[PDB]
Each structure stands twice: as C-alpha cells, then as structure tokens.
Write a protein that binds this ligand. Sequence first.
Ligand SMILES: *[C@@H]1O[C@H](CO)[C@@H](O)[C@H](O)[C@H]1NC(C)=O
Ligand SMILES: O[C@@H]1[C@H](O)[C@H](O)CO[C@H]1O
Length: 246
Amino acid sequence: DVSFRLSGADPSSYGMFIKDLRNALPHTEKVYNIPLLLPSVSGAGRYLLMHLFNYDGNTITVAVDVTNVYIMGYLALTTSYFFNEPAADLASQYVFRSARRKITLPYSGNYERLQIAAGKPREKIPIGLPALDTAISTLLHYDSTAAAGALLVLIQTTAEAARFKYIEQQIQERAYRDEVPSSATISLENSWSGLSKQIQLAQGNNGVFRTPTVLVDSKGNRVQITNVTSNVVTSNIQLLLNTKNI
Ligand SMILES: *[C@@H]1O[C@H](CO)[C@@H](O)[C@H](O)[C@H]1NC(C)=O
Ligand SMILES: O[C@@H]1[C@H](O)[C@H](O)CO[C@H]1O
C-alpha cells in the first residue's frame, strides 16, 4: 500500500508520496528508460491501495489499477464506492469486500463523465494540496455531485502526478494555495495514452513517433512531439500505458 497525510504536508512529503506511488506499480521492462506498465495482472494484485488522510486525520482508501493508474473506487469508513463501469465492477470483486455496503457511483471514471456530473470542466476546478484535503473530506460522506469534483481533484493530484513529473511539480507549487491546472497539465493528461503508445512505437522506428503528439507547453503554445529526444519523453513522463491496453 501507499499513504499520504495532509496534516503537516509540504512539497517534500507530497513528492515522497508520488515517488511511493510510482514505485508501487509493477513493471518488468523500461522503454527509453521509462517504466512500462504491465499488460495485465490477475486477481487482487491488480489493485494498489492508497491510504489518504485529510488534515484532521480522517481517511479514505483508494483502489488503483496498477496496469493503467486508473482509480476504480474507494472505501470511506464502512461504505465502498465504485465507478459505474465494468473495470470497477470487476475491482469490487477484490477490494473493500468487508464494507458493510457498496454504492455504485452514478457515473464512470472518465474525465468527460465526471465533468458532466460535477457541472464544470477540469479547467475551472482548482487543484493543489488544499483541494486534495477538501476532496478527501467530501468523499467521506456520499454526495454524488460533490464527489465528481472531488474525484477530478483526486485523480489529478495522485494518478496524473505519478504519470508526469511536470504535474507533480504543479501540485507542489500548489502546496498551500490551490490554482486551476495549467493548459499544459490538461494537455499532458489528455495525451498520456497517445504518448505512451508513440514512445513504444518509437522502438523499432529509431526513436521516431509513427504519429506526432500535439501538446500545450508552459507558455500556452501548441507544440508537436515527434521523437524520444523531446523533453516530455526524457524529463517528464514517468509511466507508460502498455500498448496492449491502447
Ligand atoms: C526530434 O525532436 C526535436 C524536438 O525536441 C526536433 O528538434 C527534431 O527535429 C526531431 N527529429 C526528428 C527526426 O523528428
Ligand atoms: O479514461 C481516463 C482515465 O481514467 C484517466 O486517468 C482519468 O480520466 C479518464 O478520462
């Protein structure tokens, strides 16, 4: 399992958490020195448990599929909560079975559905350590609309930060003050599967992407990524989604 405590949290302790999260994900191979997530894992070993504590020490446990860093559901006291999608239903066969009751959330876990449920896009939701403290607190008691925004915060501050050093750094900058994600952050999130695929295809293609990936940079400028010498590949992405899952 991995854990993170908001009480006394700072950029260092958050960085330790994101490091633990990355290190908890199994891989047998690296592609261009980036860990390649597994095609599949059987049984309960597919799921990592993340124990998150709000500033008051209240806790939820979040189940993450280790092949794709997708959050499947979470346990808050004696109630489990899962996304309304087949991968999450499957997960509910393995994790939090000791919950007194199971609630299936009235949406799947994808960004489009969550934004619809929350009534706002990711672009308008501040993120940061305080936002994560809020998110944990919201998830403690069921409120589906509130939970959708909380989950948008949770996904970006855990999974997305694990995937991209830039996103981890963005959250560290927001340790004590939330701010909406940069356009670059949103771009990276949206591009993880594409980048993972192209980095894998570049092996066999002399480091060259079969298809360029378009990203927004730190300056808000749209840029084309065409090969593995790009800073996004050498110095940003930390985990690759396996092409078998794309
Ligand atoms: C590789 O990527 C860099 C951008 O980082 C670019 O300047 C260079 O022209 C690219 N080379 C090829 C062969 O695509
Ligand atoms: O399908 C994706 C993944 O779940 C991502 O990690 C979170 O948002 C969704 O759009």
